[PDB]
Design a protein around this ligand. Sequence first.
Ligand SMILES: NS(=O)(=O)c1nnc(NS(=O)(=O)c2ccccc2)s1
Ligand SMILES: [Zn+2]
Length: 257
Amino acid sequence: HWGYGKHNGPEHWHKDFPIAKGERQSPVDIDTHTAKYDPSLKPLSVSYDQATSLRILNNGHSFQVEFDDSQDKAVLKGGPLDGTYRLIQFHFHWGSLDGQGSEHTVDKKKYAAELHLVHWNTKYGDFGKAVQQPDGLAVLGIFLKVGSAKPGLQKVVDVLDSIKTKGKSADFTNFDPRGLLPESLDYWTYPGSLTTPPLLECVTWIVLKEPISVSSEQVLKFRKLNFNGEGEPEELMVDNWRPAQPLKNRQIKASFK
Ligand SMILES: NS(=O)(=O)c1nnc(NS(=O)(=O)c2ccccc2)s1
Ligand SMILES: [Zn+2]
């Protein structure tokens, strides 16, 4: 099966998922000097006041916090989007060292980690239908740099001990994702793909310019998770990021001059 090691990592994925060599793959490097300011772009509208988290899970390649998406509770609109996108989960990618871990890069700079908030377009009725459409998903990408702790992240960090290995889950209610957002909502956007198999080209990426900062101790706890299941030989969950893919015939647009 696919993963991030030497014999099953990103350079091998195309053998099972040929779209890995597709025209609109993610992540990409954001070259700040060639991104185009688009004054037509709207401000983002994040409405997470009524979010309902359910549980946190180690899925064997990352950990994800899941939300109830049975109704318009937590949604994203505005920006480059048409319509209402419902939050279904967030997860992280991170490195073995503080100098790597993000998927997107900015002028080739790598951050310690990257947070992805995944939302799906409710006009397609369910998530499974949404992922088959070119405008089906919108993923909000937030960079993490190492500095001062983020209080809003600590609830997550403290429960990692109970989902150490693949397939473990825990109740995780009343988590407010607003605590993970930077002060500014300025962004870059481009049409892209999932960055893990099946690598479907169904994502509008929205990557925030402003990173959030987390402490060394917080990201340290991420690195103690395991890719393996319980009872199996220990493999630490680190460097679960895909390298930058060719931009090809795409333009990155910026919301800010
Ligand atoms: N890193 S990323 O592009 O946000 C994603 N990588 N895996 C993801 N999982 S997921 O949205 O739950 C998913 C699960 C099954 C099919 C399509 C998407 S999102
Ligand atoms: Zn991701």
